[PDB]
Amino acid sequence: AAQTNAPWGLARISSTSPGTSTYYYDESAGQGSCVYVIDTGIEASHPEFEGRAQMVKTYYYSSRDGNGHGTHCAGTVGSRTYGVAKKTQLFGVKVLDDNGSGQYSTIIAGMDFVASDKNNRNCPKGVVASLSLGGGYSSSVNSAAARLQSSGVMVAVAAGNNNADARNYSPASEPSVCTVGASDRYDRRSSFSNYGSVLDIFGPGTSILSTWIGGSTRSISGTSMATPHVAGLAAYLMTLGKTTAASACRYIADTANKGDLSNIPFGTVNLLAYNNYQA
Q1: Can the peptide bond before residue 171 be classed as cis, meaning omega within 30 degrees of 0?
Q2: Which of 10, 28, 144, 223 has the most CB within a 10 Å radius?
Q3: Rounded to 10 degrees, what is the CA torsion of 253, 254, 259, 260?
Q4: Binding residues for Ca(2+)
């Protein structure tokens, strides 16, 4: 399949070269997979989700996305125009309030919720969780993300936007999940992106166009924007049978575009998420 005039991030993940504008992907498009978006919620009524999104859990007085972050991330996972896996099912877990903050205990509860809730969903091609969130190092937050991974969910987490080593941020520093740094349209490390040995992969993170609340769209930047690219890619590759939840992060790294990014600090992976689709 070919989506012309796609967002640069989508075109990048299906290209060996920066600077193109068509997104190429197998028509399966993540059908039969599920992606949990653990964030401020999802505006599921957005036309861009075509009825494939739904809120499954909230820890606040509403499951609605009163912020936009979560809707934006969900759109990069699986919206018809802005999404990597355009036929995946999106499940929203609102661990962040409408100011975009959430107690660590609430985030942990959301992760354990997903580890169980997947047994309540039909995801014959596999399950993915996208964690576009972070804070200071926490052993407990890391362990919760590790449990989620262990339970058979492909966990992708943002590296963080401190332009620092991600070893000091959670769940970014949990070694068993897929820690995602951010790159820009000129294949440079995003100015803000964390780095370090705990990074597994980079994905498009700067000036990412996706769904917003109020049925709108906007471009925003962050490792929170790169993470759903990788989460969507995982869902897409699982549906193709190329990999599984336990090996998807490794598979994405193995098949990534290698050595193509600039301003990558010594010791950090120079790997850019790539779907290797041969149209």
Answers
A1: yes
A2: 223
A3: -70
A4: 16, 175, 177, 200, 260
